[PDB]
Amino acid sequence: DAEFRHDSGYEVHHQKLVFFAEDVGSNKGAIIGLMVGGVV
C-alpha cells in the first residue's frame, strides 16, 4: 500500500498536497506533530 512515486526533479515538488488530504481523512487532532498551530 502507498506505492506512490511522486518524486520531484521530473515532477512537481508539492509532495505535501497528498498528505494535506490523506491526514485530514486520517485525522487525529494532528497530535502526530502536536504543533500544527491549534494546540490550545
Side-chain angles (χ1 to χ4, degrees), residues 1-34 36-40:
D1 180 77
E3 274 63 66
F4 58 87
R5 238 111 279 171
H6 70 339
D7 31 79
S8 305
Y10 204 75
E11 220 264 290
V12 195
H13 196 245
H14 199 334
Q15 303 118 131
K16 302 127 66 261
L17 203 83
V18 297
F19 310 119
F20 196 76
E22 298 144 13
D23 92 274
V24 332
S26 192
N27 33 41
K28 60 237 137 291
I31 297 158
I32 188 157
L34 237 168
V36 69
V39 197
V40 184

